[PDB]
Design a protein around this ligand. Sequence first.
Ligand SMILES: N[C@H](CO)Cc1c[nH]c[nH+]1
Ligand SMILES: N[C@H](CO)Cc1c[nH]c[nH+]1
Ligand SMILES: [Cl-]
Ligand SMILES: [Cl-]
Ligand SMILES: [Cl-]
Ligand SMILES: [Cl-]
Ligand SMILES: [Cl-]
Ligand SMILES: [Cl-]
Ligand code: NA
Ligand SMILES: [Zn+2]
Ligand SMILES: [Zn+2]
Ligand SMILES: [Zn+2]
Ligand SMILES: [Zn+2]
Length: 263
Amino acid sequence: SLKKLDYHFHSHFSADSEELPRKHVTEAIAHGLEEICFTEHRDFYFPGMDFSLNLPEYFQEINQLQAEFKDKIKIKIGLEMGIDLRFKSEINQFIDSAPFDFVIASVHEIGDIEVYDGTEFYLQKTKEEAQREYLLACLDVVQNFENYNSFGHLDYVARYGPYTDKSIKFAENREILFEILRALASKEKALEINTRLFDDPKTEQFYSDLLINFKRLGGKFITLGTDSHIAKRDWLSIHKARTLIKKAGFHELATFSGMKIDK
Ligand SMILES: N[C@H](CO)Cc1c[nH]c[nH+]1
Ligand SMILES: N[C@H](CO)Cc1c[nH]c[nH+]1
Ligand SMILES: [Cl-]
Ligand SMILES: [Cl-]
Ligand SMILES: [Cl-]
Ligand SMILES: [Cl-]
Ligand SMILES: [Cl-]
Ligand SMILES: [Cl-]
Ligand code: NA
Ligand SMILES: [Zn+2]
Ligand SMILES: [Zn+2]
Ligand SMILES: [Zn+2]
Ligand SMILES: [Zn+2]
């Protein structure tokens, strides 16, 4: 059995969420989760929107919840760090400035163009081109940045854009995905299974292919998260992901304390 957890979600501390931290905790307890990790956004110099994070307030609030719910659920304090290698030193100073339990590395913008609905990123660009550019940016991060635990949402690019079918297929991106997966395994990083798009069977297929090939290429650590920006969760999607993880041959999920793997 896998530990019942959620290792990716956002509350009002993140610039694009307004949820109560307490409501995440009570929803988690109601479902019977054993452990959760808040992963609020920090992205440096983000285009169009400030993803800043008030660390004193964030730690204070979660620390109070840790004490209050100590006997009901384990609560960790983490970070979703948007990565851009141009800002590597500043990003590292930020990560090193507070005792985060867990850090997700994510790609949200490339060359100051946000990867999102309605941006220049998808303008006059085929889906195949957008996917390749997105995955090349992910590979660049994995090859040149080390200060994180898990690599976030590899299917992020498939959430957005003007295409009739936004899905991402493993086979169409096989070479770059193998390189990313092997690099993650080689550096003992976790692969995140992100359930945002798990309502779509093509998302399930994509993550199944990621999982099986990650195992083939030496991967060991898997994290699991909803990426929910509200307390309400799609538990069916979480259950679908847990099934895929077990079927791929992983029998444990990775959890972290002070950025070290719990053993
Ligand atoms: N990572 C966020 C995507 O959900 C970036 C964003 C939020 N709102 C506008 N842009
Ligand atoms: N045996 C399952 C995992 O421990 C029980 C469960 C799933 N979701 C909530 N509770
Ligand atoms: Cl669950
Ligand atoms: Cl900033
Ligand atoms: Cl680094
Ligand atoms: Cl949400
Ligand atoms: Cl959800
Ligand atoms: Cl486990
Ligand atoms: Na907010
Ligand atoms: Zn967000
Ligand atoms: Zn993200
Ligand atoms: Zn997120
Ligand atoms: Zn469940």
